């Protein structure tokens, strides 16, 4: 006979997960290209814009 | 010339000058006050400094013996500046040059002192900062609304002073 085996559910289990989970993501990499371009473009309008009025001020000096 | 090396003893001289050369006050302004004086002198003083250079120029090796008249005439204009300030305008050039103390000489952590100081002299002394070489096109760094450079802190007595004067219409 068979009383206090270990024995599964009637309906079984709920299924587990044992395929590939790493899903895409992130932007497309241009857009991280164009974000980079933005960035470094605008730290140089910024820091152009700093050596010219340092170039003043030297001749102020 | 080049700064000294290796090793080097300072030494002084008690002799006085000949007889023959005039007597002249010196200008006994530190760094800072001289910087914050220097375009004041140099509206009043355009004449009698490039005839001192012109002089030295001339000599050709013999200025500093030759140049003495010339050089004398500077010093005093240079002290006539300076005391027109400190007779009329000693609060707002003293603001200029503690401000200039606390920074590193840098005049572009100054400008509210400078601003008063510029109008004072502009309306008592009659002289006015012009940094010339320039075109009309550019313009001056001192008179820019917004730079890109700023001081870390503004100094406290500046900042007080320029926002009374903005209250009483001085500037
Ligand atoms: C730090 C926080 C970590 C977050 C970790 C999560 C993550 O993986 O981030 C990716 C996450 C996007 O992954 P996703 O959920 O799969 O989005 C799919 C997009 O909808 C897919 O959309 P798309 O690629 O097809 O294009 C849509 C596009 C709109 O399309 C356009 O109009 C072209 C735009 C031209 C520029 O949207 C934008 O351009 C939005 C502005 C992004 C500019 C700044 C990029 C940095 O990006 C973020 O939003 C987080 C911040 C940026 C990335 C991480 C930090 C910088 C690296
Ligand atoms: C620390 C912060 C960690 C940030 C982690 C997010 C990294 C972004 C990423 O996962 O790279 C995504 C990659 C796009 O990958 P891809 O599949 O080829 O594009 C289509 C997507 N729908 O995006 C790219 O191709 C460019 C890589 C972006 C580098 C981000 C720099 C930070
Ligand atoms: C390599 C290829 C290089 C070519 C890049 C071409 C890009 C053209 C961008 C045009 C933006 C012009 C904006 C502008 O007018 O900038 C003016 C500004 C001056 O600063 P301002 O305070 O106004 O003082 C001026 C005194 N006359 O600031 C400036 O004068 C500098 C503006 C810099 C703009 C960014 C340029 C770099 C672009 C990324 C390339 C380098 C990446 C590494």
Same mark, same amino acid.
């Given at each position: ?39 470094? $473009? ?7 814009? $700093? ?11 | ?18 007889? +023959?050369?005039?007597? %002249?006050?010196? %200008? ?75 920074? +590193? ?27 010339? $070489? ?33 209250? +009483?219409?001085?500037?």
């Amino acid at each position: 006979p068979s009383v206090g085996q270990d024995l599964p559910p009637v309906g079984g289990y709920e299924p587990v997960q044992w395929r590939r989970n790493l899903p895409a993501r992130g932007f497309r990499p241009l857009v991280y290209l164009a974000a980079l371009c933005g960035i470094c $473009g605008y730290g140089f309008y910024r820091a152009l814009g $700093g050596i010219q009025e340092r170039r003043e001020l030297k001749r102020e000096k | 010339p080049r700064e000294a090396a290796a090793h080097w003893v300072p030494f002084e001289d008690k002799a006085n000058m000949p007889d +023959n050369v005039p007597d %002249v006050v010196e %200008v006994g302004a530190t760094s800072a006050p001289l910087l914050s004086a220097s375009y004041f002198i140099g509206a009043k003083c355009k004449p009698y400094n490039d005839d001192f250079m012109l002089c030295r120029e001339e000599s050709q090796g013999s200025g500093a013996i030759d140049c003495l008249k010339e050089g004398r005439r500077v010093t005093r204009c240079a002290v006539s500046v300076i005391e027109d300030i400190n007779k009329s305008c000693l609060d707002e050039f003293r603001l200029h040059w503690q401000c200039l103390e606390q920074n +590193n000489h840098q005049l572009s952590g100054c400008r509210k002192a400078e601003a008063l100081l510029n109008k004072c002299v502009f309306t008592k002394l009659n002289l006015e900062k012009k940094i010339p $070489g320039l075109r009309p096109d550019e313009e001056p760094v001192f008179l820019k609304k917004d730079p890109w450079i700023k001081p870390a802190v503004d100094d406290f007595k500046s900042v007080r002073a320029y926002a009374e004067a903005k209250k +009483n219409g001085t500037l």
